Amino acid sequence: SDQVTLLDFWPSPFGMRVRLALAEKGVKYEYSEEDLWNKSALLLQMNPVNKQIPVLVHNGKPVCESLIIVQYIDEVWKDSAPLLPSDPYQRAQSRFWADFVDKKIYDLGRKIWTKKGEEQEAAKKDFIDSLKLMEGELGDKPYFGGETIGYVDIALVPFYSWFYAYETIGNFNIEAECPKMIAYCKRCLQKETVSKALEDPQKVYDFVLMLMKKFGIE
């Protein structure tokens, strides 16, 4: 009747974003695993600008970038509640915080396990401040999108999959500094859509241990 395809790689938090969006909005689709070393002809022709995953393919037209995909899902499949607020203002706030996750959480998270020594130390410090800022925005609400899970939650919660990696490689403990965030991420894991879309934390960690060796930054 139209069909959709998601080109993804199991441990990508960016890909889990789109997996969760599609779940929440009830969209049926086939999932196509990729090899980041052996990129498919489909991948190259669908995202010829970045040759990266995820890519949502809708009736033969591609959409690139996890966050933009989510928004597209949200604007095209409207049988379920919107994931972004309808109010211009709040929506602007969601975009900011969903974006905050890319610019801060991912960027600093990646430095924790790629960098070393004092630099790695710096990366851990900013990482925690960033989570705390997000903790502020969450306040007392059950989700970032209020009583319902919404855009920002979809942006944020896939990264729990990578928390164990960070902590272990970076030698710090998140829950210690951010009890409220961890509690949030667990309250989310109990949603079936969330637990399914996410991947196993120690499976993720092994995969990073492997990655570190193939680049020599052990």
Place this chain on the structure above:
Amino acid sequence: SDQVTLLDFWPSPFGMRVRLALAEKGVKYEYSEEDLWNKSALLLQMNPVNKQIPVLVHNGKPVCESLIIVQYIDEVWKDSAPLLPSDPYQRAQSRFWADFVDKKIYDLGRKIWTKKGEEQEAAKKDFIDSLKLMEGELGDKPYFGGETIGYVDIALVPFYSWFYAYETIGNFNIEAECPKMIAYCKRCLQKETVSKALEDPQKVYDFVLMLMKKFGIE
């Protein structure tokens, strides 16, 4: 009535995006120059999270981040031509190439004037290649938005006023490689809304000379 204020820094291309979107949508507002290394109390109140300009303040409420502000304007002031395409699939593409500027153009741009030797030149190569990808998507249309100036145009064209500075400190010539891009940039400047919002290229260059000295880097 509505009180609109733009906290901004005059040579910022990110704020120029906003000056332009405001002008293009016919929006009356007040400007307030912000210090770069001395946050006003106002800036600190409106953007405690990043403490960066541009911030738009609409009827007391703040909106952070260039692109998101611009989306906010498109959605709030609807009595002029929409900056973002109506069709979701095309909306996604605007979102993509506007984002693309943030990630490749600015990132590689900044590296050109802040870096030396092999790293500087490496940026210029990547810089050109990204412009050439943007050329490929411009096609033969007057604007990225087609016949009418659009969201991607507003995201990209503020950077032309920095081009002379890139070209001069990096010691290369953009037109030699991307003459189409230059042709378009030049074409854009004829639109008066664009010539009022953009600042003088030589005056920007003076200001980049200004940073390179402040931090000893020439």
